[PDB]
Amino acid sequence: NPFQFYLTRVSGVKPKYNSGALHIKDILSPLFGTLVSSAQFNYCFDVDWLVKQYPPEFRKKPILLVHGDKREAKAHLHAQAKPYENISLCQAKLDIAFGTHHTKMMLLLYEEGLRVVIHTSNLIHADWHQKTQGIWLSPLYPRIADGTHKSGESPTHFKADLISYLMAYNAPSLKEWIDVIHKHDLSETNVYLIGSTPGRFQGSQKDNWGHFRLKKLLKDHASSMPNAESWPVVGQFSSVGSLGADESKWLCSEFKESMLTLGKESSSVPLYLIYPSVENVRTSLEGYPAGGSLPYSIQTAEKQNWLHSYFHKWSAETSGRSNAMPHIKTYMRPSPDFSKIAWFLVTSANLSKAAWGALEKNGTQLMIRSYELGVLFLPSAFGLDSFKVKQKFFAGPMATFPVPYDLPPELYGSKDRPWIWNIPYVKAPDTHGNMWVP
């Protein structure tokens, strides 16, 4: 495979469904490189657990933790790290209310080169235990020889886009990593970077982030096919924000409009949203506690019941993960019979205005509250017109894309309800014998 898209290992499925999966210990093993320094961008950290995932010989190398915590949460994280002299912290600035640092990324500096890992898991035991999570692994990027002048840039502009993303933090500890990236050759990268950073973007900066970044890439590097209006859009996420009183406020007006872009020329396109039902969570490997990582509140949900008609159950027989609740987020554009896809995106961005951006000031300004990061797989970047869908995720032409859940997605039944984490479920017990009482 040329895609280097992996799922995390799931405890409890048969070995066939973990064969090509990765645990964090595998990512940090010496087989992937001789570690000199690393940067861990994330939302939630368990520092004691994290350090034990590094191999013993690497546990004293410098680690930078990039986080968004403030006030007491920030103090708690500093206290967690205090015992480990080699750990530094970088607080990402969040100057817009209700912003979060959701980006999940590792920068791994080796003796032999550099690797970038963009993924969806928090750095806590439970996120790597029985969840469906996604990982993109970069190639080993070699160092550019001292005295040599070359860009080290890929046809997807990944090196410049990653530096641009890091420059948005305006942070001294990340300027060091920017200088490291400058000195490496990233020309073999075949994915496009799609990031969100907080701010209000107009003019030449409007296309840099969020769903306008996606729109711009799809206009420039995908081609429209006849009957494009028949190719659905699929979104798959672990959390939903407040989208407004109806679909025309944001979901189908600006979000779906960005996602249905193809090619340069100027809607009944179906929209499938995949989000775990209550039954999905109850019968999961973790049981109801899996819902602790699916933070859809009743307050938000009650304001947008129109949205739930779009919801489809989580099903993942193709990867043996129907009972491993998703914390991956993915977006893609399948053909009407779901045998091909025009593109695939894996990201930290949930279905929310905070992450993807919302238009302001008479449509002239895109406002984003949070940091997010994902990678976009475009057929043109692999010399193809479209991707064939792999029929079994862990099965064996390597030009077929490993989609991790079942297609077509299955609509909620009439008795199904979206998982809502702050109401009780006491009618039927979960796989551990328990109810859910918030």
Residue positions annotated with a catalytic role: 102, 327
User: From residue 301 to residue 340, what is the string marking binding to ligand JTA with x (rule CB under 6 A)?
Assistant: ----------------------------------------
Give the residue with the Cβ less far from ligand JTA, 39 or 181. Answer: 39
- Judged by CB under 6 A, the chain residues 341 through 370 that form the site for ligand JTA are 348
Report if residue 289 touches ligand JTA, rule: CB under 6 A.
Answer: no
Q: Which is nearer to ligand JTA, 7 or 181 (CB)?
A: 7
By beta-carbon proximity to ligand JTA, the closer residue of 244 and 295 is 295
41 belongs to the binding site for ligand JTA (CB under 6 A): no
Which of 138, 154, 196, 293 lies at the binding interface for ligand JTA (CB under 6 A)? 293
When the beta carbons of 154 and 239 are compared against ligand JTA, the nearer one is: 239
Q: How far is the CB of 146 from ligand JTA (least distance, A)?
A: 39
Nearest-approach distance from CB 292 to ligand JTA, in angstroms: 6
Q: Which residues are annotated as a binding site for substrate?
A: 104, 329
Closest chain position to ligand JTA (CB): 295
Task: Between 371 and 387, name the residue whose CB sits nearer to ligand JTA.
Answer: 371
> Hey, which residues between 51 and 110 contact ligand JTA (CB under 6 A)?
102
Q: Choose which of 295, 365, 367, 408 interacts with ligand JTA (CB under 6 A).
A: 295
CB contact at 8 A, 45 and 107: no
Q: Are 330 and 134 in contact (CB under 8 A)?
A: yes
**How many residues interact with ligand JTA (rule CB under 6 A)?**
6
Considering the complex, what minimum distance in angstroms separates the CB of residue 285 from ligand JTA? 17
* Residue choice 8, 40, 122, 386 for contact with ligand JTA (CB under 6 A): 122
User: Is the Cβ of residue 33 or residue 68 nearer to ligand JTA in the bound state?
Assistant: 68
Compute the least distance from the CB of residue 353 to ligand JTA, in Å: 15
Least distance (Å) between residue 278 CB and ligand JTA: 17
Q: Least distance from C-beta 289 to ligand JTA, angstroms?
A: 11
Q: Does 43 bind ligand JTA (CB under 6 A)?
A: yes
> 309 burial class (0-12, 13-18, 19+ CB within 10 angstroms)?
exposed
Binding site for ligand JTA (CB under 6 A): 43, 102, 122, 293, 295, 348
